[PDB]
């Protein structure tokens, strides 16, 4: 269904879904191929053009901790991140909490950790609903939601005050921290010793 944005995102998520078994496979082994599929062209063209490089540089960073820490495989993080790791990647020290896609002129997020109204996975059913529209279900520690941190888990009190994403410039390597990390959530992050 080409009618609009609406239908480039439901279409690029389905397309993921659909091909899972074998992009699974060319993230594992040759993220730069997946990354340079003609298919992410469509979403790419709604991906705010002033920013894309920088969200497809801060996605490859995340996507390569995940294969560089062991146990960390999220299939549904990779599936919704991956069309924004299409875009010739550009760094910087930004922590996004949200990825923006323009819809009709207007900018919606998808929320880095978790749901939003663009990008809703159901954990129970497994279906992926994407702006409203069934996408297809999926067939059966947090490395890819801030870059040079791992989330350890839930909030540890004794490492304080939660800092807000912006904060963490801050932390030393190895050093820890509770972090608002979106939604009404407190999670124990580290800052990672490895770069990725």
Do not use: C, H
């Amino acid at each position: 269904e080409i009618n609009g944005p609406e239908s480039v995102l439901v279409n690029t998520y389905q397309w993921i879904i659909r091909n899972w078994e074998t992009v699974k496979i060319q993230w594992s082994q040759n993220p730069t191929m997946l990354y340079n599929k003609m298919e992410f062209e469509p979403f790419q063209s709604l991906v705010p053009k002033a920013i894309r490089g920088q969200y497809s540089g801060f996605v490859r960073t995340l996507f390569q901790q995940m294969r560089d820490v062991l146990g960390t495989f999220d299939t549904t993080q990779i599936i919704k991140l991956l069309p924004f790791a299409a875009a010739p990647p550009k760094q910087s020290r930004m922590q996004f909490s949200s990825l923006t896609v323009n819809v009709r002129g207007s900018g919606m997020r998808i929320l880095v950790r978790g749901n939003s109204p663009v990008f809703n996975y159901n954990k129970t059913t497994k279906r992926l609903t994407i702006l409203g529209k069934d996408a297809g279900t999926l067939i059966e520690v947090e490395s890819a939601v801030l870059r040079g941190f791992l989330i350890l888990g839930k909030e540890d009190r004794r490492y304080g005050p939660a800092l807000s994403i912006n904060e963490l410039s801050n932390l030393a390597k190895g050093e820890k921290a509770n972090v608002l990390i979106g939604q009404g959530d407190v999670v124990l992050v580290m800052k990672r010793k490895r770069d990725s």
